[PDB]
Design a protein around this ligand. Structure first.
Ligand SMILES: CCCCCCCCCCCCCCCCCC(=O)OC[C@H](COP(=O)(O)OCCN)OC(=O)CCCCCCCCCCCCC
Ligand code: HEC
Ligand code: HEC
Ligand code: HEC
Ligand SMILES: COc1c(O)c(C)c(C/C=C(\C)CC/C=C(\C)CC/C=C(/C)CC/C=C(\C)CC/C=C(\C)CCC=C(C)C)c(O)c1OC
Ligand SMILES: CCCCCCCCCCCCCCC(=O)O[C@H](COC(=O)CCCCCCCCCCCC)COP(=O)(O)O
Ligand SMILES: CCCCCCCCCCCCCCCCCC(=O)O[C@H](COC(=O)CCCCCC)COP(=O)(O)OCCN
Ligand SMILES: CCCCCCCCCCCCCC(=O)O[C@H](COC(=O)CCCCCCCCCCC)COP(=O)(O)O
Ligand code: FES
Lengths: 385, 54, 126, 93, 248, 71, 93
């Protein structure tokens, strides 16, 4: 046989990116996976070449970031690529998970793939939070303080857990040093989970935007989806180059260029832009413990998703009401982000509570009821009696 | 067949790619530097150095 | 995960009642022709996901000619979705051709699996 | 190597679909094919078809949530002004 | 919050360095440094700006050297361990007027004057906010506002009450080039200078952005052509189906 | 219940609403005044007027003679 | 999955050795077997057999290199002493 098939190392390269049978009807929404892989490689390479100049002391963190942006040759390129690419990493990941919810890729036989995806999502949120605290600006310090006090809400144990996390009594030098070590560490766990994700994908192949089988008309990976992914790679690099070179500090928060001061609290403490729906979910609950439980349940309710989709056809392509309520859900998630960006003021508390309820109601009540009604409507539309 | 022997061997094909990329880097760098200085005439530092003659 | 016996029971309860049928059969076929699976040249039994062993059984049950027709409808649907067009109006699946052809094979596999599970969990008449 | 479980995708030759017969393909080489002949008239009329069949499912949720956000933001900037400070007093307590 | 705690919205001034192609006005940066040194530098440190960054940007080599040699820095100690001073050089940083935080809070009624190395990048609005902050002091506060004594009013500061004094008056500095140095002229010059101090890469960032956007747009269109090319065998593929003989 | 010695007031600066720093010898009540949202604080460290929900926390401190250890 | 090349180890059932016939195994459960019955007399006599057949291939290279290292180290500490300083002068130049 061929050398790409008989060699031990090149057989994986073959069976994953050369001769992988892909369904020939998949559109550009089946390209966000390759795009996330490229953006992860961007994050790791800029992280290494920018962490060769970073000193993680609490008295030397912000000065070393400014040393990167001023004294290091092309260091502004590195930091701006790194922060804005983390923003694009979460945006492409949100689009990828929306592709997962829409076309029904969570359903059987792809439950393992969906669960490893949710694990990757949790690890990526953790990585972004740790790296945002490594800047040690104003928002970095106070966001670390608020999230660890949320961990202090745990009954009978929590204060000692938080003194363990801090490595002291408040967010201090051991906290920033261990956040830098963990933040260097967790992306390699993300890379291992990505390899496990690709294995759980490869044992059944991709889905298709129709929700029927794709075993009939398969076309290879090579040259076809290689050049289709090359198209979206160049578009992604174009938009990233715009938001790096022409308007770099748009997505960030301007308070993060104030150095970390434990005495001055800011006027409005807000995380970076993508953690705002989860921050709104947590802020909508009038309790600390139930708030933390609801914030983690807002990700575990993605795990309870394949067991509630009672639709007998895969994906929302050929269904009306499920497609409508899907876009209700997407614009609700955007409204959660925008509620979280605001203050704790009338009527944003009541709207945050209603928006959290519509989030959990979509994942727990709306999907099974609308899928059951859509099944019975498909049946009685064509069966006569 | 007039140009296909210029494309037939892959060696001369990638040699053309690398020679043209070398020429493109040089010419494109010089041209974008010249246009970016021409668009902002009167604001760069050599203009102020020429104006402030003291 | 609807267990076709259940949807068949609900649909037959709707169809056998005159008031419910007169109320929600126009809503039903309005939902069908807004769904737009006809326009890709498909039938609804071509659209049920077949990656569970009971539906895989009901596809082994199927006669040959209907299996080749189903394979052609799937390949023309993939090609039409690939070109991002629709099939011309002469090639759309009409309302009379949208026959529930695979439903009885699915229902007999449902009854077989249900009976196997019941007999696998019986008591004894003491 | 060990055997593995039954998957729903095989490989080239034993892919696992149903047996098919009498279905013939026809394709032409792209060297004798003109690419992007279908960009003009296509990016107008097909794009309008793809917009018309598919916009309203996006436009009604955007309309609902944007109207609800706008009404909430207007009520915010009302009751933190001088005109609605007594209403802020009675709904904040 | 009301509009008073949030502060008034700074408007859209048409700077000479907005837009994706316009660079800084380096004569304005030179005049902004002059207004900095003669007004701000009594009370604002500039701790992150080295002297060498001004060479070739707003001043020549000898000008930066003769401005840095007016200041004293800590030399390495002599052969008896006694601490000694030295005049500045190009590799040192611009020194602040205050030796520590407590001297700053003592000399400014408790309020700490923030370091202005990143102050146009650490405020929302940015350039417009700094300019409207400087040129925004009313002659007298609006009727009904009780200022705490020792504080001043301008609506652009969040809360209304600022601890700065109005420190831009008509012709308090003289310009080297003979520009009429009104308040708005000096405020525009220092805001351009602080934009340089926060973003010294700004010129090279925009020209490398021009190169990168041109090359990636060309690559994106070329890749659209090659994708439409190599998929042409699959878009135009056709299927006919005559149903087989049922006897088999 | 707030002090072990009425001669001395030693209180934490972590404010209950947002953690702001009140001004020493300021306000209308003879004690402290929060400049963030007007949480008026008395001479013993309690909220009277303002959105602060609870009173100011006293740290743990024990007497040792001519000093006080804090912790 | 794709097929791979011919290896020299299969799996349980098709391992790839030669076909074997008439070769019978006999093994007893370790619950009815006494472990470490063969430590005493074994760790003496078998260990002496394993040492006797196998020591000299290790002992001759160790002897050669240790004698050569010892002679070199002795010559070092000779010529950096007072007695051999003129020899150090003539061999260092
Ligand atoms: C914690 C869990 C995380 C959950 C994340 C929730 C979502 C976060 C936001 C991500 C936005 C991504 C939305 C993408 C939606 C899924 C992709 C999709 O559904 O597109 C296909 C859809 C219908 O196409 P069909 O496949 O049905 O074609 C039928 C052919 N006969 O085509 C369409 O209907 C139109 C597609 C229009 C896309 C517009 C994107 C809108 C983005 C909203 C941003 C709002 C900013 C104001
Ligand atoms: C050393 C390896 C390294 C890796 C790998 C890495 N980063 Fe970072 N990241 C850093 C460093 C160092 C910083 C702090 C310096 C900075 O912010 O410029 C940082 C900062 C960040 C920031 C804050 C940027 C800012 O300035 O506000 C975010 C957000 C972030 N990382 C996200 C990610 C994500 C998401 C990934 C991958 C999934 C990732 N990082 C991988 C090194 C790394
Ligand atoms: C929680 C959801 C989820 C997350 C998060 C997620 N994935 Fe996926 N991924 C999927 C699903 C579902 C599929 C299968 C697509 C389908 O339904 O056919 C998939 C498929 C893929 C594919 C195959 C190409 C494609 O578009 O399907 C790649 C590559 C991939 N994922 C990479 C990643 C990478 C890289 C990350 C982050 C590092 C990631 N995924 C995170 C759910 C997720
Ligand atoms: C009178 C002493 C004094 C002088 C002179 C002075 N400053 Fe300030 N400045 C301050 C103080 C004090 C603050 C901070 C006050 C506060 O936080 O309430 C300040 C704050 C600022 C701020 C930011 C204020 C904010 O709310 O973020 C800017 C910008 C600023 N100064 C610019 C300048 C510039 C430019 C000059 C020279 C042109 C200058 N200042 C000269 C005392 C001074
Ligand atoms: C379903 O069909 C598929 C499909 O099957 C596959 C496989 C893919 C492809 C998937 C991917 C490409 C994702 C793969 C991602 C990874 C394997 C993550 C690995 C990432 C890394 C960054 C590897 C780690 C390497 C390093 C850290 C090396 C960096 C070291 C440096 C820079 C050292 C520098 C120092 C000096 C001194 C030079 C698809 O996109 C796809 O859809 C079409
Ligand atoms: C690990 C990082 C993952 C990133 C995801 C990237 C997905 C797309 C990868 C594209 C690889 C293209 C190889 C195609 C090929 O070799 O075809 C080869 C030859 O094709 C070419 O020469 C393509 C021209 C050169 C394109 C160079 C693109 C480099 C920019 C890559 C930017 C992303 C790294 C085989 O082509 P053929 O079988 O049709 O004859
Ligand atoms: C957690 C997994 C992380 C990723 C690992 C899996 C993916 C690995 C992909 C590797 C792709 C690049 C490998 C191609 C190299 C092929 C050369 C080869 O196989 O020839 C090998 C020899 O390889 C070497 O000597 C060193 C290879 C080290 C590779 C270092 C990267 C010979 O192989 P073979 O026995 O089939 O040849 C018989 C001759 N006719
Ligand atoms: C290692 C992964 C890095 C991927 C970066 C993608 C993000 C896009 C922004 C890139 C800007 C950084 C480069 C730059 O500033 O160049 C600028 C020019 O812009 C470009 O050419 C970028 C084009 C990107 C093409 C990507 C090719 C793929 C290479 C894969 C790695 C071998 C500066 O050019 P100059 O220093 O003057 O030579
Ligand atoms: S801190 Fe805002 S009221 Fe006490």
């Amino acid at each position: 046989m061929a050398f790409r098939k008989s060699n031990v190392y090149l057989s994986l390269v073959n069976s994953y990116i050369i001769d992988s049978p892909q369904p020939s009807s998949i559109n550009y929404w089946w390209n966000m996976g390759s795009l996330l892989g490229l953006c992860l490689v961007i994050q790791i390479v800029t992280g290494i070449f920018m962490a060769m100049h970073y000193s993680s002391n609490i008295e030397l963190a912000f000065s070393s970031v400014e040393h990167i942006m001023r004294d290091v040759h092309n260091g502004y390129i590195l930091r701006y690529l790194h922060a804005n690419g983390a923003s694009f990493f979460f945006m492409v990941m949100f689009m990828h998970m929306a592709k997962g919810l829409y076309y029904g890729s969570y359903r059987s036989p792809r439950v393992t793939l969906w669960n490893v995806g949710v694990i990757i999502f949790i690890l990526t949120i953790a990585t972004a939070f740790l790296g945002y605290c490594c800047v040690y600006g104003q928002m970095s310090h106070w966001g670390a303080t608020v999230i660890t006090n949320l961990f202090s809400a745990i009954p009978f144990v929590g204060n000692d857990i938080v003194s363990w996390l801090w490595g002291g009594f408040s967010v201090s030098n051991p906290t920033i040093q261990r956040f830098f070590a963990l933040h260097y560490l967790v992306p390699f766990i993300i890379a291992a989970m990505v390899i496990m994700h690709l294995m759980a994908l490869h044992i059944h192949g991709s889905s298709n935007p129709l929700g029927i089988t794709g075993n009939l008309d398969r076309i290879p990976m090579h040259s076809y989806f290689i050049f289709k992914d090359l198209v979206t790679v160049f578009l992604f690099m174009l938009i990233l180059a715009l938001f790096v070179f022409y308007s770099p500090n748009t997505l960030g928060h301007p308070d993060n260029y104030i150095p970390g001061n434990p005495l001055v609290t800011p006027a409005s403490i807000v995380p970076e832009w993508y953690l705002l729906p989860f921050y709104a979910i947590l802020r909508s609950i009038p309790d600390k413990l139930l708030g933390v439980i609801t914030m983690f349940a807002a990700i575990l309710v993605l795990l309870v998703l394949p067991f509630t989709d009672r639709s007998v056809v895969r994906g929302n392509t050929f269904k009306v009401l499920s497609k409508f309520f899907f876009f209700i859900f997407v614009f609700n998630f955007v409204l959660l982000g925008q509620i979280g960006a605001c203050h704790v003021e009338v009527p944003y508390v009541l709207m945050g509570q209603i928006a959290t309820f519509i989030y959990f109601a979509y994942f727990l009540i709306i999907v099974p009821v609308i899928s059951t009604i859509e099944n019975v409507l498909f049946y009685i539309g064509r069966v006569n009696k | 067949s007039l140009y296909k022997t210029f494309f037939k061997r892959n060696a001369v094909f990638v040699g053309t790619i690398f020679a043209g990329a070398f020429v493109f880097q040089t010419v494109f760098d010089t041209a974008i530097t010249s246009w970016y200085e021409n668009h902002n005439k009167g604001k760069l530092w050599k203009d102020v150095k020429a104006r402030i003659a003291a | 995960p609807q267990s076709f016996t259940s949807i068949a029971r609900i649909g037959d309860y709707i169809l056998k009642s005159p008031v419910l049928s007169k109320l929600c059969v126009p809503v039903a076929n309005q939902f069908i022709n807004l769904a737009g699976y006809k326009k890709l040249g498909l039938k609804f039994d071509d659209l049920i996901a077949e990656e569970n062993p009971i539906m895989q059984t009901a596809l082994r049950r199927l006669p040959e000619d209907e299996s080749y027709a189903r394979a052609y409808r799937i390949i023309r649907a993939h090609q039409t979705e690939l070109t991002h067009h629709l099939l011309p109006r002469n090639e759309w699946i009409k309302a009379q051709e949208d026959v529930p052809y695979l439903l009885p094979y699915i229902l007999e596999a449902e009854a077989a699996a249900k009976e196997k599970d019941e007999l696998d969990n019986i008591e004894v008449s003491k | 190597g060990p055997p593995s479980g039954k998957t729903y995708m095989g490989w080239w030759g034993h892919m696992g679909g149903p047996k098919q017969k009498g279905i013939t393909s026809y394709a032409v080489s792209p060297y004798a094919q003109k690419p992007l002949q279908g960009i003009f008239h296509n990016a107008v009329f097909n794009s309008f078809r793809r917009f018309k069949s598919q916009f309203l499912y996006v436009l009604i949720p955007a309309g609902i949530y944007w109207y609800w956000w706008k009404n909430g933001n207007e009520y915010n900037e009302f009751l933190y002004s001088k005109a609605g400070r007594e209403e802020l007093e009675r709904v904040n307590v | 919050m009301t509009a008073a705690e949030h502060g008034l919205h700074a408007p859209a001034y048409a700077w000479s360095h907005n837009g994706p192609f316009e660079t800084f006005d380096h004569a304005s940066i030179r005049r902004g440094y002059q207004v900095y040194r003669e007004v701000c530098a009594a009370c604002h440190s500039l701790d992150r700006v080295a002297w060498r960054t001004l060479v070739g940007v707003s001043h020549t080599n000898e000008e930066v050297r003769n401005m840095a040699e007016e200041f004293e820095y800590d030399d390495e100690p002599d052969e008896q361990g006694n601490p000694k001073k030295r005049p500045g050089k190009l590799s040192d940083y611009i020194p602040g007027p205050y030796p520590n935080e407590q001297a700053a809070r003592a000399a400014n009624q408790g309020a700490l004057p923030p370091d202005l190395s990143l102050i146009v990048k650490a405020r929302h609005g940015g350039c417009d906010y700094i300019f409207s902050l400087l040129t925004g002091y009313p002659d007298e506060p609006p009727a009904g506002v009780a200022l705490p004594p020792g504080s001043n009013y301008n609506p652009y500061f969040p809360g209304g009450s600022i601890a700065m004094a109005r420190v831009l008056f008509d012709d308090m500095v003289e310009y080297e080039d003979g520009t009429p140095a009104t308040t708005s002229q000096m405020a525009k010059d220092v805001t351009t200078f602080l934009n340089w101090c926060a973003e010294p890469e700004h010129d090279e960032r925009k020209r490398l952005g021009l190169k990168t956007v041109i090359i990636l747009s060309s690559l994106y269109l070329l890749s659209i052509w090659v994708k439409k090319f190599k998929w042409a065998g699959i878009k135009t593929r056709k299927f006919v189906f005559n149903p087989p003989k049922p006897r088999k | 219940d707030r002090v072990k010695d009425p001669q001395w007031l030693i209180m934490l600066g972590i404010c209950t609403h947002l953690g702001c720093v009140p001004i020493g010898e300021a306000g209308d009540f003879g004690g402290w005044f929060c400049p963030c949202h007007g949480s008026h604080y008395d001479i013993s460290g309690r909220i009277r007027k303002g959105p602060a929900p609870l009173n100011l926390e006293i740290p743990a401190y024990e007497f040792d003679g001519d000093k006080v250890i804090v912790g």
